[PDB]
């Protein structure tokens, strides 16, 4: 997250870190046994780290649980990034508490101008690299579809939306992929892609979770 702020420990209790011997992506806990992340975050062996603040120190609110299943959307396309969603089933259920909690799925899509919270452990610089130990947060609005398409001609599908600031300076970044975009207490987005980070006229692009709610529920029920 570029241009964000330190969230505070365990203030985003649905945020997870996906770990393959190092943090590589975020995710969102949607029930005690299931996480939503990006399809491009798939790997064969993932450890989900719940309850994290400082990802480099054992502080005592963590739960480390291996993924048993990581289920990429069958229509995910790695060239266009359409359908960039994955479901992760935990090998055992997380213990839900004030520091480890689920986020609700949406009942409707969000409108332009809705303010959302975006979070992660990704890069905090728009040029070069600086990776945080503690979780970062950004408040950012959803943009109009027309503004989003104008920023990324030919690239925005109906399964994507843009959020952020066209002036630059505030955005998600590498290491934030898969993490949450929460608006009015609902998971509306998944960190997906952008051109650079926090650049002028190049907002973040997020998977539109409201298009997948039925798919998520059916995938969970059958797995």
């Amino acid at each position: 997250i570029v241009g964000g702020y330190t969230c505070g420990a365990n203030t985003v209790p649905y945020q997870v870190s996906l770990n393959s011997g190092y943090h590589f992506c975020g995710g969102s806990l949607i029930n005690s046994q299931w996480v939503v992340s990006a399809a491009h975050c798939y790997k064969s062996g993932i450890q989900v780290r719940l309850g994290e603040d400082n990802i480099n120190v054992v502080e005592g609110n963590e739960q480390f649980i291996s993924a048993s299943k990581s289920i990429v959307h069958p229509s995910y396309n790695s060239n266009t990034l359409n359908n960039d969603i994955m479901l992760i089933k935990l090998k055992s259920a997380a213990s839900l508490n004030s520091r480890v909690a689920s986020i609700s799925l949406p009942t409707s899509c969000a409108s332009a101008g809705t303010q959302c919270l975006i979070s992660g452990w990704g890069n905090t610089k728009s040029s070069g690299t600086s990776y945080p130990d503690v979780l970062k947060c950004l408040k950012a609005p959803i943009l109009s579809d027309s503004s989003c398409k104008s920023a990324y001609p030919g690239q925005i599908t109906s399964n994507m939306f843009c959020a952020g600031y066209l002036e630059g300076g505030k955005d998600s970044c590498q290491g934030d992929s898969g993490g949450p975009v929460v608006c009015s207490g609902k998971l509306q987005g998944i960190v997906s892609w952008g051109s650079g980070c926090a650049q002028k006229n190049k907002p973040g692009v997020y998977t539109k979770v409201c298009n997948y709610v039925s798919w998520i529920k059916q995938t969970i029920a059958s797995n």
Binding site: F24, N123, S177, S192, S195
Partner: peptide
């Protein structure tokens, strides 16, 4: 170069 995985998407190819 567009996806937001650490360290990058292309790095994993």
């Amino acid at each position: 170069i567009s996806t937001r995985k650490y360290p990058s998407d292309w790095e994993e190819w």
